[PDB]
Design a protein around this ligand. Structure first.
Ligand SMILES: *Cc1c(COP(=O)(O)O)cnc(C)c1O
Ligand SMILES: *Cc1c(COP(=O)(O)O)cnc(C)c1O
Ligand SMILES: [Cl-]
Ligand SMILES: [Cl-]
Ligand SMILES: [Cl-]
Ligand SMILES: [Cl-]
Ligand SMILES: [Mg+2]
Ligand SMILES: [Mg+2]
Ligand SMILES: [Mg+2]
Ligand SMILES: [Mg+2]
Lengths: 360, 356
């Protein structure tokens, strides 16, 4: 039929081969004559999938052996409270770097549970950049330092990560995990809802330094202890089996295209097509982020006024573009260009942007 | 290539629901995207989300003063979310123990507040549901919690107690929507979808609205999800999609009364087989408490138990091993397990007995 260009911000485009693979075996997985959705998570067929998803992640991000990979339910949002529930103990401080709305949501949940601090913030200038690591106010009693690697709503992204030695560095990487190589040992824990760059909604990937968190925290509900899930290899209660399966399939695809290093090359190229379009528009399009902080995953911009914003977005939707409206809290436009968004979608968007500009 | 899916959780699903999912997996509702590729704030997703709620409301005849929530974390997270929200100081989380899942729920409540055992058949290894006249209730109960179907022990409430001093709360994970329900008897009902309603990954919570909070984490307040119609954060969109599909299948076959007829016939096949076996197969549950959802039984000794389960597996039956905690055998016959599978099981049971 007509063209569809999927710029959805979460859940988002999946790589076709992962979907085609799921479709072909949906009724009969691994010759069992059952859907993977109909299997016991204690079955060897499911356990294979569960272990393979872990091993693919390990290999792709080169995760060290003293880290474990958890598959949890509840989304990144649940991690906002689970993290301080496990690590924010009395006398300690949950220290946050604010670089957008998701950072503020994380902070808010720690405030419910303990002492918090703000190490640095670009909130005053509306989160157009990542603050300089030299401006980080650190405390000796910090339980951790928490960052948001990619600020999904504002379109900014860490280019590199701080060296932290007084507390564990924690990162919400929901919208850029496995979009590039990562030195995992810079962190105590990384978490990401899978639905932006790793697959389907319904599972949350948590990579954790085992010894920081494999111990029982007195007074914490069993399901909310990291220890529970570490000990049981994320099989304490019933896992989201189809989501983990689809995550596996997506990881296989990333591996098949050459891994994190290759996908970073693709992601820089797609991003460049859009930012060059903005940058050659003589101010017709204005990117939210400062240039040194531009996200490779979520491109945020405005036209010169709200009327043009609306006409642009209406025209896009009529031409087959999906998900370009900015987050409801900030307006404007947002082109989400996660791993699986194809480059010809980006070229299509550029064409839209240039004809709209020329004909305005 | 014969396979009979008696898995206890996750479990068999209706073929039409899986076939429908397969067919549109790449192009949902002419959007040219998978349902998995849609934004949860899209109208496309929002209609699916609401359709799943609507079908549950219709099929269980849920009154307007109840809300239907779709949450993550399984029934296991409900074990702690419930007392987190309702077990206020000076009140008591009162539990009726009818199996090990009952025990797991009570344990989480003990973390958060005062608890109590209204009644328990544990001493007799959970062979039955206690008589309601035996319940010990308290003026300051925050709730009375029951497990409607005791998945590991094979017993099930035939009916529910009339409780007016506090909300009745029920873990219906392994029998929700296997028969008609009077939802007005309850303040809350919860169930992981993965036994009777859909794949794993979503938990259905039916809650009396006005029933349910300073200092509880945002994600763990029922009010958060009620207020946001379970769209506060990203829901498990594919699992809710599949739940919708399963609910359409149940509606199509005639609803909760029709599926009860099928379920009673399935359980009748197995229990008759056991009862007519002259003690060769022995059911764990007392007759009056027999579950229609999980049929638990053993052979006369462990070696015959093992020979049977081995023979079953060779013949294509999946999931019949009993829970590790109790051993024996367990035939899970949730909604989507077809009558033909139970007939096959019967025929295997009868042949095995003859050939022993
Ligand atoms: C979308 C998003 C979240 C929310 O994730 P849920 O799975 O919806 O809880 C949190 N952090 C970031 C950076 C996100 O982009
Ligand atoms: C299976 C089951 C549970 C556990 O559900 P999860 O989704 O695995 O947490 C709880 N209660 C009952 C009655 C069950 O059968
Ligand atoms: Cl943000
Ligand atoms: Cl977002
Ligand atoms: Cl039980
Ligand atoms: Cl069970
Ligand atoms: Mg490969
Ligand atoms: Mg193409
Ligand atoms: Mg119909
Ligand atoms: Mg008879």
């Amino acid at each position: 039929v007509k063209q569809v260009f999927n710029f959805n911000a979460g859940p988002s485009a999946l790589p076709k081969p992962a979907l085609e693979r799921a479709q072909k075996e949906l009724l009969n997985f691994n010759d069992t004559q059952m859907s993977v959705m109909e299997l016991s998570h204690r079955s060897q067929s499911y356990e294979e999938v569960h272990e393979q998803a872990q091993n693919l992640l390990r290999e792709l991000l080169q995760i060290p052996n003293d880290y474990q990979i958890l598959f949890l339910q509840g989304g990144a949002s649940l991690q906002f409270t689970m993290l301080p529930m496990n690590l924010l103990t009395k006398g300690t401080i949950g220290n946050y770097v604010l670089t957008g709305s998701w950072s503020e949501k994380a902070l808010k949940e720690a405030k419910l549970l303990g002492e918090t601090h703000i190490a640095a913030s670009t909130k005053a200038n509306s989160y157009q950049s990542i603050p300089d690591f030299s401006e980080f106010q650190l405390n000796e009693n910090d339980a951790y330092l928490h960052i948001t690697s990619n600020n999904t709503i504002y379109g900014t992204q860490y280019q590199n990560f701080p060296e932290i030695n007084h507390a564990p560095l924690i990162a919400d990487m929901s919208s850029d995990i496995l979009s590039r190589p990562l030195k995992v040992n810079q962190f105590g824990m990384i978490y990401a809802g899978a639905q932006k760059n790793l697959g389907p909604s319904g599972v949350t990937v948590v990579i954790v330094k085992k010894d920081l968190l494999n111990t029982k925290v007195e007074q914490v509900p069993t399901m909310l202890q990291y220890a529970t899930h570490i000990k049981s290899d994320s099989l304490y209660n019933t896992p989201p089996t189809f989501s983990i399966y689809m995550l596996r399939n997506v990881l296989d695809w990333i591996k098949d295209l050459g891994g994190a290093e290759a996908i970073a090359k693709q992601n820089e190229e797609k991003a460049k097509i859009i930012y060059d379009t903005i940058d050659e528009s003589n101010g017709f399009y204005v990117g939210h982020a400062e240039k040194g902080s531009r996200s490779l995953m979520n491109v945020t911009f405005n036209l010169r006024n709200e009327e043009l914003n609306q006409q642009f977005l209406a025209k896009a939707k009529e031409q087959g573009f999906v998900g370009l409206n900015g987050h409801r809290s900030v307006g404007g436009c947002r082109a989400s260009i996660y791993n699986a968004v194809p480059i010809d979608a980006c070229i299509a968007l550029r064409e839209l942007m240039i004809q709209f500009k020329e004909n305005a």
